[PDB]
């Protein structure tokens, strides 16, 4: 029950999608180019990013071509060994600590890049709360190297919450930082990460498919009464005229477009 909604800018940021992972290195063919365009990123990013245009949205574009590049280096024998996922996971993680020697591949760099303008403009805590969930993105490509109530494993490796945080940075606006770790906002953003598991193992947790659309269902129902709790957790955490526009902003263009902007994409 959440409105479908797209960025008025997507047929410029689609048109223009292949200019950056083309000069980073991490398309090289046109072969290469084409399988890009053909996953439809950003479209995808047009929809988790509805309020950004522009410089705003390429990055969400190119956020999205970066991790389904990224994802995809794992699809042979390197996902399939730990020490071997973590020492590519190690060069990008890198990035968040510091400048990359210019020997380190190119997607290592393309990171960079995102990660470069991501924090840019943004709060010190804010950057230093994302680069933790960066953390835990990488973090979870080894945990499932090492495997080879699942939720454990897939809720860090979709990639959700850095796919969330990109919305603050390209609605440029922070949710209070003391409401994003509140126990009400975990619960939503829980959600998010679950729905967004189950809606792509559909598209693995099927080991059945009527019982996910419940589940799906069933926490999206508990995603409205969290909703609905937030003009009192404002009201507990003392947040102002600002915070409180805040929080609304990050309600509506971060965790409901994360939700609905992945259902209409499949």
């Given at each position: 029950?959440?409105?479908?909604?797209?960025?008025?800018?997507?047929?410029?940021?689609?048109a223009?999608?292949?200019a950056?992972?083309?000069?980073?290195?991490?398309?090289?063919?046109?072969?290469?180019?084409?399988?890009?365009?053909?996953?439809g990123?950003?479209?995808?990013?047009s929809?988790?990013y509805?309020?950004?245009?522009?410089?705003?949205?390429?990055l969400?574009?190119?956020?999205?071509?970066?991790?389904?590049l990224?994802?995809?280096?794992?699809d042979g024998?390197?996902?399939?060994?730990?020490?071997?996922?973590?020492?590519?996971?190690?060069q990008?993680?890198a990035?968040?600590?510091?400048?990359?020697?210019?020997?380190?591949?190119?997607?290592?760099?393309?990171?960079?890049?995102?990660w470069?303008r991501?924090?840019?403009?943004?709060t010190?805590?804010?950057?230093?709360?994302?680069?933790?969930?960066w953390?835990?993105?990488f973090?979870?490509y080894?945990?499932?190297a090492?495997?080879?109530?699942?939720?454990?494993?897939?809720?860090?490796?979709?990639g959700?919450q850095?796919?969330?945080?990109?919305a603050?940075?390209?609605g440029?606006?922070?949710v209070?930082?003391?409401?994003?770790?509140?126990?009400?906002?975990?619960?939503?953003?829980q959600?998010?990460?679950?729905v967004?598991?189950?809606?792509?193992?559909?598209?693995?947790m099927?080991?059945?498919?009527?019982?996910?659309?419940?589940?799906?269902?069933?926490?999206?129902?508990?995603?409205?009464l969290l909703?609905?709790?937030?003009?009192?957790?404002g009201?507990?955490?003392?947040?102002?005229?600002?915070?409180?526009?805040?929080?609304?902003r990050?309600?509506?263009?971060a965790?409901?477009?994360?939700?609905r902007?992945?259902?209409?994409?499949?």
């Open positions: 029950p959440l409105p479908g909604r797209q960025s008025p800018d997507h047929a410029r940021a689609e223009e999608q292949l950056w992972p083309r000069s980073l290195g991490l398309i090289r063919s046109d072969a290469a180019a084409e399988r890009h365009l053909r996953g990123y950003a479209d995808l990013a929809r988790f509805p309020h950004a245009t522009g410089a705003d949205l390429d969400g574009v190119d956020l999205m071509s970066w991790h389904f990224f994802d995809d280096l794992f024998p390197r996902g399939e060994n730990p020490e071997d996922t973590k020492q590519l996971t190690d990008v993680a990035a968040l600590d510091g400048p990359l020697p210019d020997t380190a591949p190119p997607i290592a760099h393309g990171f960079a890049d995102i470069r991501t924090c840019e403009g943004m010190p805590a804010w950057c230093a709360r994302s680069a933790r969930h953390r835990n993105y973090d979870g080894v945990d499932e090492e495997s080879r109530q699942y939720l454990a494993m897939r809720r860090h490796t979709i959700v850095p796919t969330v945080d990109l603050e940075r390209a440029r606006f922070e209070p930082h003391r409401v994003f770790d509140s126990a009400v906002m975990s619960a939503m953003l959600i998010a990460v679950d967004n598991l189950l809606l792509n193992d559909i598209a693995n099927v080991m059945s498919v009527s019982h996910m659309q419940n589940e799906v269902r069933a926490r999206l129902e508990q995603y409205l909703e609905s709790c937030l003009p009192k957790v009201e507990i955490y003392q947040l102002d005229t600002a915070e409180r526009e805040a929080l609304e990050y309600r509506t263009d965790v409901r477009t994360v939700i902007g992945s259902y209409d994409w499949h």
